[PDB]
Amino acid sequence: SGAIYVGNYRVVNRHLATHNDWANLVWEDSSRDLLVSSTTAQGCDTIARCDCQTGVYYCSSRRKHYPVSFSKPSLIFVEASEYYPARYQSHLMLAVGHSEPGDCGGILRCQHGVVGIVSTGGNGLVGFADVRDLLWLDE
Numbered sequence: 175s176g177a178i179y180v181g182n183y184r185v186v187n188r189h190l191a192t193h194n195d196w197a198n199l200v201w202e203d204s205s206r207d208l209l210v211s212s213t214t215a216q217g218c219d220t221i222a223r224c225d226c227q228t229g230v231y232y233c234s235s236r237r238k239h240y241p242v243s244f245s246k247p248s249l250i251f252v253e254a255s256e257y258y259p260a261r262y263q264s265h266l267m268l269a270v271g272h273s274e275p276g277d278c279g280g281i282l283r284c285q286h287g288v289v290g291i292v293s294t295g296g297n298g299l300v301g302f303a304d305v306r307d308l309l310w311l312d313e
């Protein structure tokens with residue numbers, strides 16, 4: 175669990191989206207595992223606009239923040255799950271680090287702000303769905 179709250183938007187994992195996220199849908203992309211919904215209150219998270227490859231993420235299965243080097247956003251194959259069939263997920267970044275299924279939603283940050291959120295993992299790896307390209311989140 176976990177979300178990004180910026181202005182009148184809430185960015186969540188598409189597979190974890192609630193009824194209210196769909197009843198107030200702005201944009202959703204199953205290939206990126208992202209869903210953005212509208213909010214009644216103003217959010218205050220700052221989104222980063224950069225090409226950073228180092229940052230810190232929150233791991234709820236360890237109650238700990240961890241520093242990571244991560245890859246540039248790209249198409250990476252993700253094995254079949256109860257949410258999606260076997261496919262390439264786009265705009266995905268990998269790092270060496272611990273993650274478990276309940277870790278989706280944890281924020282990845284750098285000195286410029288919010289980079290993305292935990293979306294995939296396993297075998298000593300962790301995947302993050304990038305949001306730095308969604309320039310509309312700020313306007």
Ligand SMILES: COc1cccc(SC)c1NC(=O)N1CCC[C@H](C(N)=O)C1
Pocket residue numbers: 189207252255257258263273274275276277278293294295296297
């Ligand atoms: C069950 O495999 C894992 C093992 C450790 C950590 C994790 S992060 C939950 C996972 N989960 C995944 O990578 N999945 C399942 C959840 C949806 C993900 C997607 N982007 O389609 C793919």
Ligand SMILES: [Zn+2]
Pocket residue numbers: 222223224225226284285286287
């Ligand atoms: Zn940055």
